[model samples]
Target: NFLDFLRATEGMVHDYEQRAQALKENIEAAINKMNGVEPSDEYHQVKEQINETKNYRKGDKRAFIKEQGDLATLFGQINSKLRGMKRPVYVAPEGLDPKSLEGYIANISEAERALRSKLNTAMRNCLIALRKAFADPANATDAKINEYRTFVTDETSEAPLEEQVATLKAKLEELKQVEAQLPPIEEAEKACEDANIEDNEYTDVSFDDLQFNYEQTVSMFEKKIVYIEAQINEA
Candidate 1:
């Protein structure tokens, strides 16, 4: 059954790739068709603005010709030129929906799913790296040894009251706003009763959610490190 599942998923990935390649070709052909149309005066006016605005960034006060070195860039230039041109009776090509439009949208959904899988695997690999760093003998300073112990040991005990209240209030504020929001306080505490999970396979934004989760984890751990350093100095 597992092998069957693997075969199915692998086949889907290959088919997705084929569709993606076809979608790209279809889109370029559509663009090529549009470029065949003669643009009106608006094209020249917008083209002038584009050159002036783009060249202004160069600080040389010169006219800018859009580069046509790569096919991607050339196609993009065509798109911009088309947008600037006033085409009152422009008609879209047939097969666009079947060949490119629908396939492109479907590809986006598939791409997002692939992104989530990649990130989750990335997180697992990172956790493994963190564990290895903890275990390395070269990292054996007194503070680091202490850190290593904490890393492996399950920390379910109640923390300091002031810190606890601050965490609780922060949790509440976040709830009022949450991803990976800590489980409910009671459930969170109970969930940790077992121990720290090292290689947990867990499950995105839509992009902003994944981006925010990354930023949150990084900033949180950085602050924790600083906090620990302060405690060590005080002690």
Candidate 2:
């Protein structure tokens, strides 16, 4: 039955989700196995950079498009060309009649406006995207991720598994795999203590917290898979 395919889909997503969760739990243990000590600077920096990426409002390129200054400057320069004209010199959209005074000063009869509104906006947006590519929390976040591949792939936050009769079987096995990656609580603490990333001071973290994240990750992964599968079955 096609419905069987949906049932299998849940199991497949569970598998993928478990792997993702396993990575996260593994990261947590490796990063946060400290014995309640303050987190290391390297970890802190990674965390902040990750937050920066997470915090940024996506698709904001169209939002600001570089506000102020440049637009006015462009308009001022374009307007300077029309100082003595009086025939509403708005540039024609098709190919702006350069030889005629009418297309040049048409807007002068209406209001003191520039004829290059579209051009001005386009240039402004171009500058914005150009600048953002080289600079920003956007670029900065990406730069940080270049050093840390796992965090960039971390899908823990998006976990939302399903709940079904067959889900428990998948969940239990995946859960063990997730939990097995972690060092013993005692070992985790010491490893975290020894963990000196970026050649910086060590950051302290706790085993109890690591354990929490591990289990929480499993539950979330399982539930998400189940929910998605159930939806497919319903459809």
Candidate 3:
């Protein structure tokens, strides 16, 4: 009876085995790339993943998907680390800043178009976001916004997104509690308006450019007195 069952479902078993092997390949590739860069951690869970996947029963799709979904989550976290790790600059004799004698025609342009384009977009989006975020006090230091900012712009933020978000939520609430009381946006601007400057070094708009230079002299940290109660709450 067992022999008959094995013969009847061999194809289905093969499909499950194939799928499982593919998932293992992804994990192995991720691990290899991760190991290449160093400062890497997280091993045993994935090793268990390899063992579990390889041994999954052929007929159970639900368990397969559940495992696959989790593996994808792990992959997502790994991708964040990959992007955060800057690729070494490649040069072609045809491209700018060539130190190598190696001649490049197709590859250099491909790198420029394929790699550099994505890299620049990540860098540029934050530039625009930072400008807009800075001018708006209500949203300026909001923890969620900065968390997004850091994830995109800063590679150092490659932890599991769920973990990152939990830490971010607590910090965001804390910022609102303290920063909410900080003399309001109007007061910070009013100080700039009230300052004796004739015109800003840049262009003239509402007494022009209020920044660290001005804020340092006055209510920068003073504004942070809002967070004192938070320190009490912390302890």
Q: What are the C-alpha RMSDs, in order, of all predicted structures? A: 26.4, 33.4, 27.7
**Candidate lDDT (C-alpha), each:** 0.38, 0.37, 0.38
Candidate 3: TM-score?
0.20
Give per-model TM-scores: 0.22, 0.22, 0.20
| Model 3 lowest lDDT segment of ten | 92-101
Residue 8 lDDT in model 2? 53
CA lDDT of 58 in candidate 2?
38
Task: Provide the clash count, candidate 1.
Answer: 0
How many steric clashes between backbone atoms does each model show? 0, 23, 0
- What is residue 28's positional error in candidate 3, in angstroms? 19
- Models sorted by TM-score, best on top: 2, 1, 3
CA-RMSD of model 3: 27.7
